[PDB]
Design an enzyme around this catalytic site. Structure first.
Site, PDB file in Angstrom:
ATOM      1  N   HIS A  41      -7.006   0.772   1.317  1.00  0.00           N
ATOM      2  CA  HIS A  41      -6.919   0.288  -0.066  1.00  0.00           C
ATOM      3  C   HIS A  41      -5.527  -0.268  -0.445  1.00  0.00           C
ATOM      4  CE1 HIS A  41      -5.750   4.456  -1.420  1.00  0.00           C
ATOM      5  NE2 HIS A  41      -4.930   3.751  -2.197  1.00  0.00           N
ATOM      6  N   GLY A 143       1.234   7.106  -6.067  1.00  0.00           N
ATOM      7  CA  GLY A 143       2.107   6.764  -4.950  1.00  0.00           C
ATOM      8  C   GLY A 143       2.026   7.728  -3.776  1.00  0.00           C
ATOM      9  N   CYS A 145      -0.666   8.318  -1.966  1.00  0.00           N
ATOM     10  CA  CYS A 145      -1.661   7.869  -0.983  1.00  0.00           C
ATOM     11  C   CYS A 145      -1.018   7.606   0.363  1.00  0.00           C
ATOM     12  CB  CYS A 145      -2.406   6.640  -1.490  1.00  0.00           C
ATOM     13  SG  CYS A 145      -3.365   6.942  -2.992  1.00  0.00           S
TER      14      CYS A 145
END
Ligand SMILES: CC(C)NC(=O)CN1C[C@@H](C(=O)Nc2cncc3cc(F)ccc23)c2cc(Cl)ccc2C1=O
Ligand SMILES: CC(C)NC(=O)CN1C[C@@H](C(=O)Nc2cncc3cc(F)ccc23)c2cc(Cl)ccc2C1=O
Ligand SMILES: [Cl-]
EC number: 3.4.19.12
Lengths: 305, 305
Positions: A41, A143, A145
């Site tokens: 993503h 942030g 991820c």
């Protein structure tokens, strides 16, 4: 003596954390050998997140659209490919800090350490478990991820989780390091909800054996139970069913303390019925389910008090 | 979302852990620059520990009696000296992995990360607090002596603890990195006991603010209290007194949530007098006191190292 929620030392994983940027999106990547692994993503806009077509979004990208930063050094991307929900960025430099590692897919009830990162920089380490509903109760902000979950049994790092998203209840969802999600989750902003969660019964039993090893027995009783009667009572308290595999797994702790698994099951049945009556077990007023039988044997002494 | 007991990333400290052997005794050392720091009891036999004269025991040792192992490399001891309860072994090689560091003495209530080690090899990392009675509730087995406690402030490691012993209640006692004990303890095999402990009030308040930030508000009420009336209540429940410094320290969390410190004190008073009534706060049925106001702000803002 003592019993703490203990994470593995994070150094071997810190030396693998990098920052990955596509356009306006920045998240974390895991740099092992000459490959950087990160959630796919990273290539999405906020306008793409409802129904992204990752294959179509990826074909429009070139190697130089991905910016990978390791500390203050910019890495050069020389290739890219997608494997399930993970993006793999081939870089021109092998990570000199690459530890001995494996990719392992874990099952619900298994525990691991999470190295929470922001902008490719580690901020903290905590221990957690894969819940029966396939989510993890992490501590993650925007942030985070790309942050990873791991175990370090002996000198080898086994990577088991990569963080992808937060669900509406505040719990977290992610994948193994081959990009396969844990649970029925998808990397889309569509309405998704975690299933009803349950307590990891085999882990509570392991933690009750840890309390006995550390010298506490107030909760034991003179009773035993059949496995079937225990499961009938356990499921009324939202406890996971205890299988014969779980009973076999608790064998060593049973032999060490002298308390048969079904006798410890009778103590747990009584605890669920009575509560703790102002008492604590290993400093907790709740039954703890995020220590596996393997964690208890690793942390506890081999000599019962 | 989420709130976990979070330790600092341990990598900068893992690169400093070594194994120190003196005769039959083996424990951990901290290698910074060309000096290895370890508990001075490494020179004692089990008989010497009954009533040791460390200067007399030390004068009989030579540099070659101390075996220091860093990974698979043997370090050469070229000097030795004692500072309080710490032994300093001068080695011929400066640690190439020496991070930017300071030695700091902490106060009760302050938290830190512990890197538990055995044979100079790190096994786990956990977070804990210096209790008001100067002990720490650690998780340590035989071989753990010399394990260290630390914090990271920006890119600098502040070493605050070195493990020396376990008390009969299973709690732990140690020194700062200058060999001064925290608490009225001595390094010898003799009857010693922890004083009556108290709860760290400023830390419980910080954790209540963390719960509010995470959507847990059931415990809030319309009431306020004076600082003097709260301290009369808090003293009744074995809680540490709350000072104006503590109130000032909680200022930012108070402004963020909209709950004045004394407004939150009135919530804490009601929880002490009435309990939780079957409810939990951040997954706990006890009031948690091992998160400082700074820890709550750091975890709720994503500060990296
Ligand atoms: C509150 C959540 C739903 N965040 C958002 O509002 C937007 N969001 C971004 C991202 C995501 O969830 N990122 C985070 C991951 N862990 C902890 C987060 C905590 C936070 F406060 C914000 C973001 C977080 C994401 C990724 C994927 Cl694959 C699918 C959907 C999303 C997504 O919807
Ligand atoms: C706890 C006691 C009864 N253990 C011992 O048999 C002897 N013991 C050894 C040592 C010490 O405390 N070592 C440990 C340190 N942390 C966790 C331990 C856990 C364990 F199971 C055993 C030992 C541990 C020590 C050091 C100093 Cl400065 C003063 C006294 C002693 C000492 O009495
Ligand atoms: Cl597993």
């Amino acid at each position: 003596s003592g019993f703490r929620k203990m994470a593995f030392p994070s150094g071997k994983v810190e030396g693998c954390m990098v920052q990955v940027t596509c356009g306006t999106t920045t998240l974390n990547g895991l740099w092992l050998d000459d490959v950087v692994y990160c959630p796919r993503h990273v290539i999405c806009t906020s306008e793409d997140m409802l129904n992204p077509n990752y294959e179509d979004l990826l074909i429009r990208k070139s190697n130089h659209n991905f910016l990978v930063q390791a500390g203050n050094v910019q890495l050069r991307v020389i290739g890219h490919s997608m494997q399930n929900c993970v993006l793999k960025l081939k870089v021109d430099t092998a990570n000199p800090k690459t530890p001995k590692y494996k990719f392992v897919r874990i099952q619900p009830g298994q525990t691991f350490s999470v190295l929470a990162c922001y902008n490719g920089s580690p901020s903290g380490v905590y221990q957690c478990a894969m819940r029966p509903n396939f989510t993890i109760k992490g501590s993650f902000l925007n942030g985070s991820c790309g942050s990873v979950g791991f175990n370090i049994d002996y000198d080898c790092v086994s990577f088991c989780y990569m963080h992808h998203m937060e669900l509406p209840t505040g719990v977290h969802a992610g994948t193994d390091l081959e990009g396969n999600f844990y649970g029925p989750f998808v990397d889309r902003q569509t309405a998704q909800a975690a299933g009803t969660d349950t307590t990891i019964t085999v882990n509570v039993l392991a933690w009750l054996y840890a309390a006995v090893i550390n010298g506490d027995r107030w909760f034991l009783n003179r009773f035993t139970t059949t496995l079937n009667d225990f499961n009938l009572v356990a499921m009324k308290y939202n406890y996971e069913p205890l299988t014969q595999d779980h009973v076999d797994i608790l064998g060593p702790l049973s032999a060490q303390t002298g308390i048969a698994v079904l006798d410890m099951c009778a103590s747990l049945k009584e605890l669920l019925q009575n509560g703790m009556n102002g008492r604590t077990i290993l400093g907790s007023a709740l039954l703890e389910d995020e220590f596996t039988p393997f964690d208890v044997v690793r942390q506890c002494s081999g000599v019962t008090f």
